[PDB]
Ligand binder design. Structure first.
Ligand SMILES: CN(C)c1ccc(O)c2c1C[C@H]1C[C@H]3[C@H](N(C)C)C(O)=C(C(N)=O)C(=O)[C@@]3(O)C(O)=C1C2=O
Lengths: 1022, 50
């Protein structure tokens, strides 16, 4: 091809233009986003039952709908939560390529037929099916900077005007409200109303009658009588639209003409819908708006688009309500892709410098500076060609592959400054010869690199996608590189081709070296023996090295996680939240930007006794000392918070991929499998736990990820005694309920918007058990009766959060690997400890620890094929079931040194390392292949020496190696290996490549010529 | 019911929720005077109707 392409030179300038122009067009089409999708798809169904409780909510709702989740395709497993806040959440995870959109339909659809079997109070709140994906694009806050507005107030404005405003903007995915939206609060008084002989029932059925909406006909329309002339629409009753109108509700009229309005029976503010989660930002009332991705949107483009729409409505904005920004991924994705792109622009300057200061030009260096930015740009096209996206994973994809594709340029061009110097021919004629000794050997370094890469993109479920992420990118860069090295590069440098502090100086250094190879070629085994020590190096270096997933990173935010004991209260939790918030401002005002703290939503549950504090920091610019970064701040804070009496308060950095797997943890589910009750299983749990602790050797940190049984106050209607008086189990229940739990009566329209109307006892009459007294019910004959008359109450222990795995009641158990042991073997002990638990009880693996179980080890099984497909591939490049075997032995040479990220640093065998490792084996074999080729060319075509060719081979190669290799080991370490500014992954990739590159060169130069001679001699002898 | 008692009551609620469905091009709705809603979502030529 290329020979008959350096004759045709302006055609290979076209092909260059398309590639480029096409690659440019993709840049402006490509989705941009911190990460792509990697978690299996999951559909979450969640419901409310106001005033409920774990058991009730569980047996009335969760069980039911579970018995119905059948006939849905691709369901991986199903987990559920029923907790004393009256809330259920069922989460169904799917297999991998499962269309998220079809998975929801099916769920949602199969739900729609269980609805009838649910309680009227729940069907009313509505059940939600929606796709879960805890990957937030951001979270605007909307605080008030006057103190004029409350939590509930601010939330309402946010709902009324800005919410939809956002929801419609340039591809936002979903907006969630951090608040209510006002509800007609009718706050009953038991005493104000036991007077008029009234219950909450009488109150409720009035709200129905007075706040309804009736229908009646038109006038003509429906078949009218001859020659009618008027047709109009009758307008009957329609909803009350004010707190005022609600006050006036004929509740009672007795002999007297007494006028008992709802006003005369309760407060009637216009408050929040639910009242049990307290949002404040830097100490003052706050509401939020958490926006999501948007399926093929631009993370930067919609990031801008939000701030625009927020500005286009910043006037209007009452009193003084600032919009605030405690979480925006954008900054990260920006000054992390503004880097990377710098790595590209820079490792270019390098491959002009470690090129000119070696070849000496302005027209020889201008060739790979035309070649690289093409394969690169052109690679984008190929990404876009398979849906892919500009994203952290795919970005470093290319960076981490720049060395592989610079070495395709350098190699070509200087392998002419060889040829045109000995028998020194012209440009248009020497390039015609050079592109002949390398030609077929690139078409082999292609195939070769197609294995040792493609075999990723085939890994397990969850983390298997991250791999593909790099895989396709690299193989896309790599193959598109060879593609120009056969088409543009030659055509280019056979045209435009023909300082002093070098030349004669390198001229001797080649000779001092080339001779060292000789002699280390007579015994032919002093070094072969040295090698076996290096292969042992890596083979023991391997096992020693700890493994990981993706190293955490200063992302500019982190979390404080506060948890009060059993019975604790909202207000009682607020006090704690404050200290936390106080500490962070006054005591960290040089890093902390804000504390958005939510009092109510915790981790292992919800409830008054739990909270979280989202804390967002100042710029990286403004947080300079390493001790002003995150793993610093959190470390301090976590300790600092050990002066709190009862109130476990942690602070942890969020993992890189938020909506994804976690620590070397296992995820353990303890199922039940027979009639065994809650307690029996609670006991069962307690063994495996207490047992697991006896073995800190196999390491642990085993722990229930759920809540412990609490006390609860059971009222108990005496059935008979009820019949004895005129008292109806229904009138009973409603009152006790609606008072103490709250009930949702119906809707009304508030300023052009439908909103709910709740009805429940003012807080004063619903606090202590001794408060039951207050509540009376109108009986048969019409005399108010006290609760003590028909009931009796004992205290007892229940569960505020009952959990289940795959329909059977579960208790999930978390736990840590071991300081020396593998995630795998910690599991394997666990199963054993499980197998001795009282008959009935079972276990199952979920989370990552399932994505692990059902994704074997694979790596050894997969590369076993890569390898075979390299020897198979490499033989055919030459012509031998032997020669290729010389090229392979380079694998370990890069490994050691790469693997020496134990001695020059303390890190972990991770995804970045693993791909860095591959990039290095890539240039390693590439070297070996061009050598074993150059040794075979002038030995089959020149008939030269069994050993003489191998000396003339490593003579001709030593220069490329050095050029490209210095190019890499510099520009692969700019801020790479030395950062702190959205870094982490930076040091990770680079370090593995640096030390691996050092050893892969400063060592293969001596060894591959040894390899070519040690092989050959073994075959043809016997 | 009638426009301002349906446009308010139904048409909004539905419309509020027509946020972010791939290849959306433009939505248009009308309430009634007899209680009758027609939200229509037109998608980008190409997009899969199912
Ligand atoms: C935890 N989540 C991020 C936040 C953060 C700040 C907030 O200010 C809030 C939430 C959750 C949302 C959930 C919403 C939900 N929805 C909008 C009706 C909801 O169903 C409930 C509920 N638990 O029933 C709320 O409490 C809720 O009204 C609420 O009070 C919230 C709100 O107060």
């Amino acid at each position: 091809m290329p020979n008959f392409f350096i004759d045709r030179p302006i055609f290979a300038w076209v092909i260059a233009i398309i590639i480029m122009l096409a690659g440019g067009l993709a840049i402006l089409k490509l989705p941009v986003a911190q990460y792509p999708t990697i978690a299996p798809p999951a559909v979450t169904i969640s419901a409310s039952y106001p005033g409920a409780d774990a058991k009730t909510v569980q047996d009335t709702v969760t069980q039911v709908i579970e018995q119905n989740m059948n006939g849905i395709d691709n369901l991986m497993y199903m987990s559920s939560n029923s907790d004393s806040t009256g809330t259920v959440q069922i989460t169904l995870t799917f297999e991998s390529g499962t269309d998220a959109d079809i998975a929801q339909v099916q769920v949602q659809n199969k739900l729609q037929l269980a609805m009838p079997l649910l309680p009227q109070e729940v069907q009313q709140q509505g059940v939600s099916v929606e796709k879960s994906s805890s990957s937030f694009l951001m979270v605007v806050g909307v605080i008030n900077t006057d103190g004029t507005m409350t939590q509930e107030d601010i939330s309402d404005y946010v709902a009324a005007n800005m919410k939809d405003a956002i929801s419609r903007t340039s591809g936002v995915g979903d907006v969630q409200l951090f608040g209510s939206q006002y509800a007609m609060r009718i706050w009953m008084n038991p005493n104000e109303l036991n007077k008029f002989q009234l219950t909450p029932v009488d109150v409720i059925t009035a709200i129905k009658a007075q706040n309804a909406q009736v229908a009646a006909g038109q006038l003509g329309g429906t078949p009218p009588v001859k020659g009618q002339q008027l047709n109009a629409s009758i307008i009957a009753q329609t909803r009350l639209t004010s707190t005022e109108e609600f006050g006036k509700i004929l509740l009672k009229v007795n002999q007297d003409g007494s006028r008992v309005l709802l006003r005369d029976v309760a407060k009637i503010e216009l408050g929040g819908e639910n009242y049990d989660i307290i949002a404040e930002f830097n100490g003052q009332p706050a509401s939020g708006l958490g926006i999501k991705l948007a399926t093929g949107a631009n993370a930067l483009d919609t990031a801008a688009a939000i701030r625009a729409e927020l500005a286009k409505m910043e006037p209007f904005f009452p009193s003084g309500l600032k919009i605030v920004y405690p979480y925006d991924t954008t900054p990260f994705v920006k000054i992390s892709i503004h880097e990377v792109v710098k790595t590209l622009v820079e490792a270019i300057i390098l491959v002009f410098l470690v090129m000119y200061l070696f070849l000496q030009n302005f027209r020889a260096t201008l060739i790979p500076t035309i070649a690289v930015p093409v394969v690169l740009l052109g690679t984008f096209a190929v990404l876009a060609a398979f849906g892919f996206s500009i994203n952290t994973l795919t970005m470093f994809g290319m960076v981490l592959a720049i060395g592989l594709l610079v070495d395709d340029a350098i190699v070509v061009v200087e392998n002419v400054e060889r040829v045109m110097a000995e028998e020194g021919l012209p440009p248009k004629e020497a390039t015609r010869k050079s592109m002949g000794q390398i030609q077929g050997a690139l078409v082999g370094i292609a195939m070769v690199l197609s294995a040792v890469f493609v075999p990723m993109a085939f890994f397990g479920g969850s983390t298997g996608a991250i791999y593909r992420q790099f895989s396709i990118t690299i193989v896309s860069a790599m193959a598109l590189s060879v593609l120009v090295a056969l088409i543009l590069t030659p055509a280019l440098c056979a045209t435009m081709l023909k300082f002093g502090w070098f030349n004669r100086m390198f001229e001797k250094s080649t000779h001092h070296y080339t001779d060292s190879v000789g002699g280390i070629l007579r015994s032919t085994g002093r070094y072969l023996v040295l090698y076996l020590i290096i292969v042992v190096g890596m083979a023991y270096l391997f096992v020693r090295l700890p493994s990981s997933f993706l190293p955490d990173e200063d992302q500019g935010v982190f979390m404080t996680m506060v948890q009060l004991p059993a019975g604790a209260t909202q207000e009682r939790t607020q006090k704690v939240l404050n200290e936390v918030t106080h500490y962070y401002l006054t005591k960290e005002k040089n890093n902390v930007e804000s504390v958005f703290a939510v009092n109510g939503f915790g981790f292992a549950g919800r409830g008054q006794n739990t909270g979280i504090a989202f804390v967002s920091l100042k710029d990286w610019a403004d947080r300079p000392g390493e001790e002003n970064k995150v793993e610093a701040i959190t470390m301090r804070a976590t300790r600092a918070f050990s002066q709190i009496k009862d109130a476990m308060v942690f602070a942890f950095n969020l993992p890189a991929i938020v909506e994804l797997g976690t620590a070397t943890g296992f995820d353990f589910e303890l199922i039940d499998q027979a009639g065994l009750g809650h307690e029996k299983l609670t006991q069962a749990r307690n063994q495996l736990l207490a047992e697991a602790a006896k073995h800190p050797d196999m390491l642990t940190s085993v722990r229930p990820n759920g809540l412990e049984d609490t006390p609860q106050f059971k009222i108990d209607i005496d059935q008979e005694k009820a019949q004895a008086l005129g008292v109806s189990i229904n009138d009973i229940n409603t009152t006790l309920g609606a008072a103490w739990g709250g009930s949702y009566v119906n809707d009304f329209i508030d300023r052009g918007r439908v909103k709910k109307v709740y009805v429940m006892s003012e807080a004063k009459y619903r606090m202590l058990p001794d408060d039951i007294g207050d509540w009376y019910v109108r009986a048969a004959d019409g005399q108010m009766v006290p609760f003590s008359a028909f009931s009796s109450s004992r205290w007892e222990y229940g569960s505020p959060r009952l959990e289940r795995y795959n329909g059977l009641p579960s208790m999930e158990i978390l736990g840590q690997a071991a300081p020396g042991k593998s995630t795998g073997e910690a599991m394997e002990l666990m199963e054993q400890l499980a197998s001795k638990l009282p008959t009935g009880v079972g276990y199952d693996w979920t989370g990552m620890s399932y994505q692990e179980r059902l994704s074997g080890n694979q790596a050894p099984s997969l590369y076993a094929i890569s390898l075979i497909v390299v020897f198979l591939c490499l033989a055919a490049l030459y012509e031998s079931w032997s020669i290729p075997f010389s090229v392979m032995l380079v694998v370990p040479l890069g490994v050691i040194g790469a693997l020496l990220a134990a001695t020059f640093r303390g890190l972990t065998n991770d995804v970045y390392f693993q791909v860095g490792l591959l990039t290095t084996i890539g240039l390693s074999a590439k070297n070996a292949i061009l050598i074993v080729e150059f040794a075979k060319d002038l030995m089959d075509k020149e008939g030269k020496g069994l050993i003489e060719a191998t000396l003339d081979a490593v003579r001709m190669r030593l220069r490329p190696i050095l050029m490209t290799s210095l190019a890499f080991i510099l520009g692969v370490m700019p801020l790479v290996i030395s950062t702190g500014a959205g870094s982490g992954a930076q040091n990770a990739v680079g370090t593995g490549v640096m030390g691996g590159m050092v050893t892969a060169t400063v060592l293969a130069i001596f060894f591959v010529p040894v390899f070519f001679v040690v092989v050959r001699r073994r075959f043809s002898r016997k």
